Design a protein around this ligand. Structure first.
Ligand SMILES: O=C(O)[C@H](O)[C@H](O)CO
Length: 303
């Protein structure tokens, strides 16, 4: 078999690992051993920005990545990074799976990033080591690491937070040394990366939805038979299901485990305060993405 390197930032025992393994197993069977994965979890091939760059260049075969730094390569994808755009998992998943999400995959493909299917990272939540976050004003003044994403940076600034973009593999040490007070990630990431060791506080702010996506290099895609192309896509859609299931499991059980680990969890925040804070940034978001595209997303699964 041709060995395809698949990288991701979480450990193998994670939502992304579940997605990668499901995808890889289906590709290996579906292509009758023409292709087989070798996994590189825990940023062995670098963080997400570096990995996507390598996939676009062809020097890395596959990545399971959040949209965080993806917008650097395909700016249209940042529409899904807008804070409080999505209402819940049903809403977000339907958008990603429907025509809107499918169009974003094609926009990626035009830039040499063969997005096979949207998987999932999850709704992101704020952690810090200084104080509980009950309302937007409690976040003001905190230094918080963000992903390498201008929409997150601009959006989160409206909460009064002071953002610093950092690649994921540098995050644990940054939190440990106090370079920043906090960060934000889905429960699946907080669990699998043991941030409980260096963050005392968690608030279920659910401030953005973080999709993930299995991306193949155009170098490899263009060498595939038309039949194998179909196998890769089908395999990635099976991965979507397994990965979301693991997200679901992580959330149902994760809060209890994080509490046992010593985290102080705020389960009900003043969501209105955060939504009101970010509203002014929608001027910029609409100018960039189109108010009608924002509205099209909001309309999906709405009452
Ligand atoms: O915080 C981040 O960088 C991401 O959530 C992580 O790499 C998983 O995609």
């Amino acid at each position: 078999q041709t060995i395809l390197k698949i990288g991701y930032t979480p450990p193998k025992d994670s939502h992304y690992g579940v997605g990668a393994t499901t995808f890889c197993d289906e590709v290996e069977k579906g292509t009758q051993e023409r292709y087989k994965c070798q996994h590189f979890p825990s940023s062995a091939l670098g963080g997400e920005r570096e990995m996507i760059e390598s996939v676009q260049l062809g020097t890395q075969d596959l990545v399971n990545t959040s949209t965080g730094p993806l917008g650097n390569f395909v700016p249209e994808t940042r529409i899904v990074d807008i804070p409080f755009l999505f209402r819940d998992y049903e809403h977000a998943r339907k958008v990603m799976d429907g025509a809107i999400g499918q169009d974003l995959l094609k926009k990626m493909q035009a830039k040499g990033l063969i997005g096979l299917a949207w998987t999932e990272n999850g709704f992101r939540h704020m952690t810090n080591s200084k104080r509980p976050i009950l309302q937007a004003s409690d976040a003001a003044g905190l230094k918080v690491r963000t992903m390498e994403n201008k929409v997150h940076m601009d959006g989160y600034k409206t909460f009064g937070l002071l953002p610093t973009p950092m690649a994921f593999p540098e995050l644990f040490t940054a939190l440990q040394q106090g370079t920043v007070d906090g960060q934000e990630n889905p429960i699946p990431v907080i669990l699998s990366s043991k941030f409980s060791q260096v963050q005392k506080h968690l608030s279920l702010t659910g401030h953005v939805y973080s999709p993930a996506v299995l991306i193949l290099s155009s170098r490899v895609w263009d060498k595939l038979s038309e039949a194998d192309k179909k196998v890769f896509v089908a395999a990635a859609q099976k991965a979507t299901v397994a990965q979301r299931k693991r997200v679901n499991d992580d959330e149902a059980n994760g809060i209890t485990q994080l509490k046992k680990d010593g985290m102080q969890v705020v389960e009900k925040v003043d969501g209105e305060s955060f939504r009101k804070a970010v509203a002014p940034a929608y001027a910029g978001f609409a100018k960039e993405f189109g108010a009608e595209r924002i509205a099209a997303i909001q309309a999906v699964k709405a009452e």
